[PDB]
Structure formats: C-alpha cells, structure tokens
Amino acid sequence: GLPTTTLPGSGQFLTTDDRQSPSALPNYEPTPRIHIPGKVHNLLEIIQVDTLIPMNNTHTKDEVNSYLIPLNANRQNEQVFGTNLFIGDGVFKTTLLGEIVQYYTHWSGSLRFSLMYTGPALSSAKLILAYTPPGARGPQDRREAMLGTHVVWDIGLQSTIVMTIPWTSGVQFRYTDPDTYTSAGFLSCWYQTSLILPPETTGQVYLLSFISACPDFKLRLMKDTQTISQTVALTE
C-alpha cells in the first residue's frame, strides 16, 4: 500500500549515528533515579577548578616537591618562573586542564592563573610576574619583563595572587598538533627585589601555582586520545 524507494548507503553501519533502537527488556522498571549531590552537565564546570601546576618538576623522580617553586634570598632581577603556555604539553600536560584539552582538539578561551605563597608571616618580597602574548619573544630579565605587562602583587601582606590570561585568536584557533613552536604564550616571574627572610630562617620558602579555565573556555572537536599508543584487551 505504501510505495517506497531504496537509498544508497543501505545496510550502512555508522558507528556514531543516533538511532532509537528496540529494547531487549521492553518492560522492566529500573532502579529509580534518586538525588545525589554534585550533578554534572558539562566539562566546563569540571575545568573551572584551579588544580595546581608542577613547575619544579626538574627533579628526576616525581615527589611532592614537583609543585614547590623554590624561593631563596639575596637574588634579584633573575628567574623565578618560565613556561610556554601550550596546554597539553610540557608542564601543563599533567593538570586536569591537561588531559581535558588532550581529550578534545582546537580550543578557545581565557584562563585563570593563580599563585600562592608558602612562607613565614614576617617575610617580605617583591615579585614581578609578566605575561607576554603568543607571537612575542619572552623577556630576558626583570627589566624587559617590567616593560611588559608586569604584575607585582607583592609578598609580605598578600599571599594569593590571581591573574587572568586573556586569549587572542591566532589562525582562528589554537594549533593542537605536536610541535615545539614558540607562539603559544609565555608567563614568567622575576624577583623585583631580593627575598627578605625572617631572622634565623635558614632554608627555603616556596610558591604554589594553580591553573584553570575562565567560563569563556571553549572545546570544539573530539579526538581519539591515545597518549600511550593504547591497546590492552585484558578481561577477567
């Protein structure tokens, strides 16, 4: 009674196609839906949390000290931080933002860099931390960083320093293929003055660095995510 045609692409098996399929248990009430806290609808609220950054991961075996940026006394106009802002590579790879951006593809959005001091109450220091945009060669000292968009937010009365990281569109998005190009962004910190330790301190103090994404974040295409060239078929 109903005439119909064929379509090329018959017997097709798209893996990815959303088609309603009939039920093997057509009449079965499941265990009913209850309310449990922390309901999630999006990975944006997953990556809204400042995790931490391993910056002092320059020791061989991985320990707790991988996150402690070491601060000594009587050093000024010299290096504290320094990083390429290529998330999914280098030191940002093993953050939660790390494997999330390793999951997808081309991304967009501003960030929320945070920074926090671990030292004595009666200690003071001035730390210039500077951002240089992608496509610009990063500064070589405290001088050239100060001519950049320098941030002090000093140590001695304030511990938690947050700086937003504005995003700039390059070729419409961010390159997500493995290269060591140097146009990803650059953040680094310098002693504006020497660290003033309290008397008979005799050691080191440290900083703690966090990273996350502002609500402006964007994730566009999805990828396979090998990361180990993965194949294990072990079942029990």
């Binding site: 399929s21 093997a24 248990l25 999630v40 609808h41 910056m55 990083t83 280098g90 093993t94 078929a233």
Partner: protein, 230 residues
C-alpha cells in the same frame, strides 16, 4: 553554548569496540576443540576492557547508562567464497542474576525470558538494554566489600553487574571448517554522571581494584633545561 559537544551525553555516548571474539560450529564433539573459544562464548559484560583502558568513565564516580550493544558479526572463514550459507548467529543478553550457559547445546539458550536475537552473519543487530543497576547509579569507583558476613567474592564489586553477553551458532555437520568473528560495540545513552574524580597517572593494572601499577616510569615530564623556558 547549549550544544551537545562538550556535555556529558556526547562525551561518553560514542560507540567503541569491546570484546573481539572468534567462534565456530563443528559438531556435537567431533575433533577435541570444544570449550575455550569454539562453539560458544560468554563475555560477562564489563566496560573495563577498552573504554580507552577505562579513562573517561573513571574520570567520574557515579554514572548511569542506557546501553546499545550493536553486535557486528562477520565470517572470518572466506565469506567471499562460501562459509556463510545461512550461517545464523545467535546472540543473547543474559541479565545479572541469571545462569550463564557453558555449552553450545545447553538449556539456557532457549529457556524462558532471556533476550536472544538471531541475525545473518555479516549483518548487525541493535539493542537497547535499560539501566540494569543494583544501585541507583553504576558504582564504577566503590570503597567497601560486599559483606562482613559471607561476603560475595571481593571488592571487585560485581554486585552492580551490568549483564552477560553470550554468542553461539545454530548449525551442524562436521565435514568442514568455518570461523566467525563477533565484535560488539557498546554505546551508552542518557548518561548521567556524578562526583568528578581526579584522573589516573598510569594505565591501570587491574579491573575493579583501584591499584596503581608498580615499577613506574615518570608520568610527568621534566623541564627542557631549567625553569628558564624556551
């Protein structure tokens, strides 16, 4: 955006190859190759095999599925030549809390209320098994044993079992060789996740037990030089 790209439903709802297997049908007993991978196969479904070696689901703690197993069966023995003459394959979703076949010509292929399908080799079959969970969500990441009493098995926690797939052939006549490869693709619908969880460092070493493997290599990368970048 309210677009289903970075949400949870698009995140886990893709279809992935789990449980490659290879069966045949020969005779009642015939040549002594009966039990291991021939004449039938049971899986005891567990997404613990190759959801990228348990990663995106392990990123959360509590999930709820609505599964769509799409069984792709094919004739490894040259289908182009023959070895496909009405080779009807029988799949079967044995629900949790039901006895498992361990023989090809066994009673629980035809028993009562065990959802079994039949399709031609080289074609597919689409399911929709609802959320068969003991708890209100799938406890993918659970702390606790089953009892302080008799205690079922161990903290593998197979109490929130999902099911058990069984595959076999309804055919006869040992004079010849055939071989059938069966490849099931799980797809989860209406995925509701809860309680985000920090990701693993290594690829795992066990199913169910959250053990981190010994003898590890450094999962994090050394700086290229010093804290001085570039």
């Amino acid at each position: 955006f309210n677009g289903s790209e970075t949400d949870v439903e698009c995140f886990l709802g893709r279809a992935a190859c789990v449980h490659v297997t290879e069966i045949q049908n020969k005779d009642a007993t015939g040549i002594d190759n009966h039990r291991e991978a021939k004449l039938f196969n049971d899986w005891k479904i567990n997404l613990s095999s190759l959801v990228q070696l348990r990663k995106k689901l392990e990123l959360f703690t509590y999930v709820r599925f609505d599964s769509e197993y799409t069984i792709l069966a094919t004739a490894s023995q040259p289908d182009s030549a023959n070895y496909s003459s009405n080779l009807v394959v029988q799949a079967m979703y044995v629900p949790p809390g039901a006895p498992n076949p361990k023989e090809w010509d066994d009673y629980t292929w035809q028993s009562a209320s065990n959802p079994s399908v039949f399709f031609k080799v080289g074609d597919t079959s689409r399911f929709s098994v609802p959320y068969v969970g003991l708890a209100s969500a799938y406890n993918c990441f659970y702390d606790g044993y089953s009892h302080d009493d008799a205690e079922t098995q161990y903290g593998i926690t197979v109490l929130n079992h999902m099911g058990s797939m069984a595959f076999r052939i309804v055919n006869e006549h040992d004079e010849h060789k055939t071989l059938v490869k069966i490849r099931v693709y799980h797809r989860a619908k209406h995925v509701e996740a809860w309680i985000p969880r920090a990701p693993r460092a290594l690829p795992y070493t066990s199913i169910g037990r959250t053990n981190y493997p010994k003898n590890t290599e450094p999962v994090i990368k050394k700086r290229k030089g010093d804290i001085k970048s570039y």
